[PDB]
Swiss-Prot record:
Keywords per UniProt: Dioxygenase, Iron, Metal-binding, Oxidoreductase, Thioether bond
Protein name from the UniProt record: Cysteine dioxygenase type 1
UniProt PTM: The thioether cross-link between Cys-89 and Tyr-153 plays a structural role through stabilizing the Fe(2+) ion, and prevents the production of highly damaging free hydroxyl radicals by holding the oxygen radical via hydroxyl hydrogen.
Induction: In hepatoblastoma Hep-G2 cells, down-regulated by phorbol 12-myristate 13-acetate (PMA).
Annotated Fe cation binding sites: H82, H84, H136
Reactions catalysed: L-cysteine + O2 = 3-sulfino-L-alanine + H(+)
Function: Catalyzes the oxidation of cysteine to cysteine sulfinic acid with addition of molecular dioxygen.
SUPFAM superfamilies membership: RmlC-like cupins
Length: 187
């Protein structure tokens, strides 16, 4: 049981099949992403780090059905609290560990945001989120080692909202790619 990709290339091929249609079986995609055993030799071309902030590195555009990308988290790097613009979002660890904090959605009223769950993603683990699940923040647990994660978003999206933990107020954020297909972007 569970089709096991032996390479990152196998995984991409399978994903093209699983997203070719109208339905997407979330638990099936998750298990297959989790079954791929992270191999740094295969994804090192995408692992382009920045001193001050995590980077987004596009791997594959999934024939318009999804975006597959690798996020590189320096020592102590973390994300804002954010949503996912009504898409599916899968997150798989490739190296290190991320702490995921799930938050409830704010009301129109201003106050402190509420944590709904907290966990550390294990080696090779694939997590899943969408807007109905909640909001989340993700961060490198380590101040001495990096983390690397593989993200799949379907449909693709290039804007989301970031939330202020103190008030729940949000701002629209346009995300950019640090590199695409192993090639640094103009910035
Ligand atoms: Fe996210």
């Amino acid at each position: 049981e569970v089709l096991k990709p032996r390479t990152l290339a196998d995984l991409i091929r399978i994903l093209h099949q699983l997203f070719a249609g109208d339905e997407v079986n979330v638990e099936e995609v998750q298990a297959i992403m989790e079954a791929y055993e992270s191999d740094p030799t295969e994804w090192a071309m995408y692992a382009k780090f920045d001193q001050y902030r995590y980077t987004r590195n596009l791997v594959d555009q999934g024939n318009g059905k999804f975006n597959l990308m690798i996020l590189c988290w320096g020592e102590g790097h973390g994300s804002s609290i954010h949503d996912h613009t009504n898409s599916h979002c899968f997150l798989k660890m490739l190296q290190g560990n991320l702490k995921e904090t799930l938050f409830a959605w704010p009301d129109k009223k201003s106050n402190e945001m509420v944590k709904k769950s907290e966990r550390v993603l294990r080696e090779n683990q694939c997590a899943y989120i969408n807007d109905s699940v909640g909001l989340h923040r993700v961060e490198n647990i380590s101040h001495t080692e990096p983390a690397v994660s593989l993200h799949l978003y379907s449909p693709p999206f290039d804007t989301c909202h970031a939330f202020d933990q103190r008030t729940g107020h949000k701002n629209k954020v346009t995300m950019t790619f640090h590199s695409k297909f192993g090639i640094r972007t103009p910035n």
